[PDB]
């Protein structure tokens, strides 16, 4: 039970190329996932989490950062974007994830404000100030989140 078995739909889209300049990969480089907590539902589609961060390692696995319970490092620090397939389609859970370094498209599931980015392990919150951008006149907090980078 739960999505993330067989060929399944998408949250972050499919087969994205040219989605980032110098801050994200533009060639397809996807690779399979060893997952952390994805919350009430496996491989996301829910309030808590939505499919967390991966960071590339040597081999045919990419795996968890894993940042808990929602810490963040600014500029580049790797986010999971789109998925690829070869025997199963869908965003993580033993299926191929394409990553970037903070590129597009990111599209994670929340209630209200925050949203933000999700890792594995924790509830859906958004990073603050001295974790993402505290450049110029900005409001971001743990009560305040929108889908994209701040």
């Amino acid at each position: 039970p739960y999505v993330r078995l067989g060929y399944e739909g998408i949250l972050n889209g499919a087969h994205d190329i040219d989605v980032a300049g110098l801050n994200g990969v533009e060639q397809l480089a996807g690779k399979f996932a060893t997952i952390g907590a994805n919350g009430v539902k496996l491989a996301g589609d829910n309030g808590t989490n939505a499919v967390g961060l991966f960071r590339e390692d040597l081999g045919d696995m990419v795996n968890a950062s894993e940042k808990a319970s929602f810490y963040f490092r600014g500029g580049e620090y790797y986010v999971n974007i789109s998925r690829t397939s070869l025997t199963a389609a869908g965003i993580a859970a033993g299926d191929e994830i394409t990553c970037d370094a903070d590129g597009k498209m990111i599209k994670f599931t929340g209630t209200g404000k925050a949203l933000g980015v999700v890792t594995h392990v924790g509830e859906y919150r958004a990073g603050n100030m001295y974790e993402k951008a505290t450049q110029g006149v900005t409001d971001t907090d743990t009560f305040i989140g929108f889908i994209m980078y701040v």
């Binding site: 940042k67 808990a68 319970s69 929602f70 810490y71 924790g122 509830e123 919150r125 958004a126 990073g127 603050n128 001295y130 974790e131 907090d141 743990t142």
Partner: protein
């Protein structure tokens, strides 16, 4: 005269709270400082209090 026109009812007064038990501040060394008050307004003469806009 400020006292006359309106009056300030206060549901709860200004209080600081500080949280290292909040999710995103805990993980880090960071501490979150909240400052808040919950207020309300009474109008003792909102049907009067004179105002003007210069036309000069």
């Amino acid at each position: 005269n400020t006292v006359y026109v309106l009056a300030d009812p206060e549901f709860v007064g200004v209080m600081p709270i500080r949280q290292d038990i909040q999710v995103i501040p805990a993980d880090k060394p960071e501490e979150l400082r909240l400052g808040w008050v919950i207020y309300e307004e009474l109008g003792l003469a909102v049907v009067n209090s004179l105002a003007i806009a210069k036309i000069s």
